[PDB]
Amino acid sequence: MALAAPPGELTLALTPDDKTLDPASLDRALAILAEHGILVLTGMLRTRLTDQLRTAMLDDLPEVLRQQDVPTNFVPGHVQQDPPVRESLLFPDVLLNPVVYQITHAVLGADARNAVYSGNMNLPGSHEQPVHLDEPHLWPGISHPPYCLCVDVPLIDFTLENGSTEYWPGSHVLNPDECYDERGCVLPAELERRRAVAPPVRFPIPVGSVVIRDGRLWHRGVPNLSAAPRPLLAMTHYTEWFDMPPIQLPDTVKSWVDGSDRHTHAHFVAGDVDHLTGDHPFA
Numbered sequence: 001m002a003l004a005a006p007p008g009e010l011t012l013a014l015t016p017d018d019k020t021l022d023p024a025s026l027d028r029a030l031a032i033l034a035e036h037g038i039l040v041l042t043g044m045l046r047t048r049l050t051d052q053l054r055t056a057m058l059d060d061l062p063e064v065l066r067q068q069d070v071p072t073n074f075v076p077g078h079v080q081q082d083p084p085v086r087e088s089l090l091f092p093d094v095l096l097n098p099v100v101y102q103i104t105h106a107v108l109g110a111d112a113r114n115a116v117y118s119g120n121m122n123l124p125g126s127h128e129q130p131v132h133l134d135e136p137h138l139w140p141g142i143s144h145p146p147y148c149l150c151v152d153v154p155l156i157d158f159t160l161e162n163g164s165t166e167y168w169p170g171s172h173v174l175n176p177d178e179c180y181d182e183r184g185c186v187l188p189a190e191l192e193r194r195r196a197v198a199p200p201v202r203f204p205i206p207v208g209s210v211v212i213r214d215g216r217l218w219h220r221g222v223p224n225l226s227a228a229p230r231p232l233l234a235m236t237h238y239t240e241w242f243d244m245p246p247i248q249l250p251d252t253v254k255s256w257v258d259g260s261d262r263h264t265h266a267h268f269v270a271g272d273v274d275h276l277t278g279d280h281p282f283a
C-alpha cells in the first residue's frame with residue numbers, strides 16, 4: 001500500500017538482452033511465485049515494442065467504445081480489449097518471451113501453453129473492482145499447485161494515480177470453503193481475516209516490465225485518476241490438460257508460432273483476424 005517502486009521481495013531486475021535466468025535467478029523467481037504468487041520482472045521489453053502495442057491499442061479504443069454493449073470487468077471503466085493479431089504487431093519477445101516460458105515451463109511443465117492474448121483498458125474515472133481471482137481453484141476446500149500463470153505487460157508506466165493493480169501476496173494458496181462467489185470475488189469475512197495477517201500492496205510498474213502471477217492471486221483493478229487510458233496486454237499460460245479455446249492468429253505467423261517449444265494453443269486463419277468483434281468467417 002503506497003510504495004514508490006516494486007518491492008524487492010517480488011522483483012527480479014533484467015535487461016531485454018537476457019534470454020535465460022542463471023540457475024540461482026530461476027530458483028529465486030520460482031521461490032517468489034510459490035511464496036507470494038506474483039513476480040515483477042523489470043527491464044524485459046524494448047521501447048520499440050511497447051510503443052507500437054500502446055499505439056495500436058489506443059488507436060483501437062474508439063472501435064471498442066462504439067460497441068452496442070462495451071464489455072467491462074465487474075464495474076465501469078475496466079474495458080476488455082484484445083490487442084491486434086496483425087503479423088506486424090505479433091512480436092516473438094512478447095508472445096514467446098524466452099524468460100517468461102523458462103519460468104512457466106519450470107512451474108507448469110514443458111507442455112504448458114499460452115491460451116490468452118487479451119487486454120484490460122482502465123479508463124479515466126474508472127470504479128473500484130471487488131477483490132477477486134481471475135482463474136478459480138479447481139475444487140473448493142482443496143490446496144493444489146498452480147495450473148495457470150497470468151503474464152501481464154503494462155503498455156505505459158503504471159502509477160498509483162493511473163490504476164496500478166492492488167495485489168494480495170500469498171493469497172494464491174487460500175481455498176477455504178465458502179471463500180469465493182460464482183464470479184470469483186472473495187467473501188468479505190475472508191478478505192478481513194487475510195488483511196490482518198498479509199495486507200495488500202500497490203506499486204508503480206514501469207513500462208518494459210512483465211508481471212507473472214498465479215491466476216488464483218487475489219487482486220482488484222482500482223480507479224484510473226489520470227487523464228489518459230491505462231492499457232495492459234494480458235496472456236495466460238495453462239497446464240496442457242486445462243481446457244481452453246484457442247487464440248485466433250493469422251497463418252502469416254504459423255511458421256514461427258507452431259513448432260516452437262514455447263507452446264501456444266492457437267487456430268491459424270487465412271487472411272486478417274478481426275481481434276475486436278471476433279466475427280470473421282471460419283472461426
Ligand code: NI
Pocket residue numbers: 132133134219220221
Ligand atoms: Ni482481475
